[PDB]
Design an enzyme around this catalytic site. Structure first.
Site, PDB file in Angstrom:
ATOM      1  N   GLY A  71      42.752  37.390  30.679  1.00  0.00           N
ATOM      2  CA  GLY A  71      43.821  37.332  31.672  1.00  0.00           C
ATOM      3  C   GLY A  71      43.327  36.767  32.997  1.00  0.00           C
ATOM      4  N   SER A  72      43.766  37.391  34.081  1.00  0.00           N
ATOM      5  CA  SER A  72      43.460  36.888  35.418  1.00  0.00           C
ATOM      6  C   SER A  72      41.986  36.837  35.751  1.00  0.00           C
ATOM      7  CB  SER A  72      44.163  37.733  36.481  1.00  0.00           C
ATOM      8  OG  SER A  72      45.566  37.621  36.361  1.00  0.00           O
ATOM      9  N   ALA A  73      41.153  37.580  35.024  1.00  0.00           N
ATOM     10  CA  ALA A  73      39.716  37.569  35.309  1.00  0.00           C
ATOM     11  C   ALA A  73      39.067  36.203  35.065  1.00  0.00           C
ATOM     12  CB  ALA A  73      39.011  38.668  34.518  1.00  0.00           C
TER      13      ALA A  73
ATOM     14  N   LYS B 236      40.558  33.371  36.090  1.00  0.00           N
ATOM     15  CA  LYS B 236      41.094  32.456  37.098  1.00  0.00           C
ATOM     16  C   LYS B 236      40.069  31.938  38.084  1.00  0.00           C
ATOM     17  CE  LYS B 236      45.820  34.041  36.604  1.00  0.00           C
ATOM     18  NZ  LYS B 236      46.857  35.035  36.998  1.00  0.00           N
TER      19      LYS B 236
END
EC number: 3.4.16.4
Length: 314
Positions: free
Chosen positions: A60-62, A64
């Site tokens: 997920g966002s990790a 980005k």
């Protein structure tokens, strides 16, 4: 000699166990790395297999910060550019953030964890280029830890990527890696652009790693990540009194993830937490894994004797 620090391992287990019970979760994992050497200071799992190394997760966002760091490193964006961040589709598939932000600069993209902003940055590179980048971070590359059930992770061949798939990978879905692989990837940010191997043995000097980003890029990206834990950011649950913290919260039944480093300017420790299938009192990464991150981080910094860089409120 074994790299685990008994005081940090005890802390990690304490806080991991409190969070799993409070959120009535199935399981959880914590990794604590020395951010300059790659030594594993703590590796805690709830009873059973070593989930830190066996369980593939979508980051997920990790993921980005790496995409943003790549686009900055290659000169495909800079800190002045404002990007149109309206949601869009590719064929029938939407790409959208939690909110509709008309436009964001790169610091905003990080702060608000924009899927749209990150996918547009990724799209400035060919699929093959992004594939090699993910490979270079260690995704799809076995760590050979020796623990039963260990996963290499999943990185699909770039020849099979559709445009929608490149987009979703850039905000952390459609590829998979272990918590240990993800914590390893963060050494490229903390060790000034140089990915470290990780070790269970004590390291008298930093081992030879490999350069992924320019040092200036890694430093700028660490500074951008600080806004995530400050008011207005998506990771305020992981703020630590007296320190600048760079972190990301993530979610993928759910897995709740939170990963970060401190002090942001000169990192000492990486802490990564996953809570598997929380069923009470929240299920997103920030709500669920933020609080144990916060306690493990502030506790480890105190154990390791790192002085606060800003004033204590509490």
């Amino acid at each position: 000699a074994l790299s685990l620090d008994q005081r940090i391992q005890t802390l990690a287990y304490e806080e991991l166990n409190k969070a799993v019970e409070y959120h009535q979760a199935k399981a959880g994992t914590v990794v604590v790395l020395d951010a300059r050497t790659g030594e594993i200071l703590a590796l805690a799992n709830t009873p059973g297999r070593n989930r830190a190394v066996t369980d593939m997760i979508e980051p997920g966002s990790a993921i980005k910060p790496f995409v943003i760091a790549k686009a900055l490193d290659a000169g495909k964006t800079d800190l002045n550019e404002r990007l149109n961040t309206q949601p869009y589709k590719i064929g029938p598939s939407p790409v959208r953030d939690t909110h509709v932000y008309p436009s964001l600069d790169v610091r905003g993209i990080m702060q608000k964890s924009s899927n749209v902003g990150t996918s547009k940055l990724s799209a400035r590179f060919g699929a093959e280029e992004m594939y090699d980048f993910y490979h270079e971070l260690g995704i799809g590359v076995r760590m050979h830890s020796g623990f039963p059930g260990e996963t290499a992770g999943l990185l699909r061949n770039w020849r099979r990527w559709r445009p929608i798939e490149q987009a979703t990978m850039s905000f952390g879905y459609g590829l998979q890696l272990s918590l240990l692989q993800l914590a390893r990837a963060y050494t490229a940010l903390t060790h000034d652009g140089v990915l470290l191997p990780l070790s269970f043995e004590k390291q008298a000097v930093a081992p030879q790693g490999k350069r992924i980003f320019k040092e200036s890029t890694a430093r700028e990206v660490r500074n951008l990540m600080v806004s995530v834990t400050e008011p207005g950011g998506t990771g305020t649950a992981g703020a630590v009194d007296g320190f600048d913290v760079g972190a990301k919260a993530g979610t993928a039944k759910h897995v709740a993830t939170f990963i970060g480093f401190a002090p942001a300017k000169n990192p000492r420790v990486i802490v990564a937490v996953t809570i598997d299938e929380p069923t009470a009192h929240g299920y997103y990464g920030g709500v669920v894994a933020g609080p144990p991150f916060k306690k493990i981080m502030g506790g480890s910094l105190n154990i390791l004797g790192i002085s606060p860089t800003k004033p204590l409120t509490a």
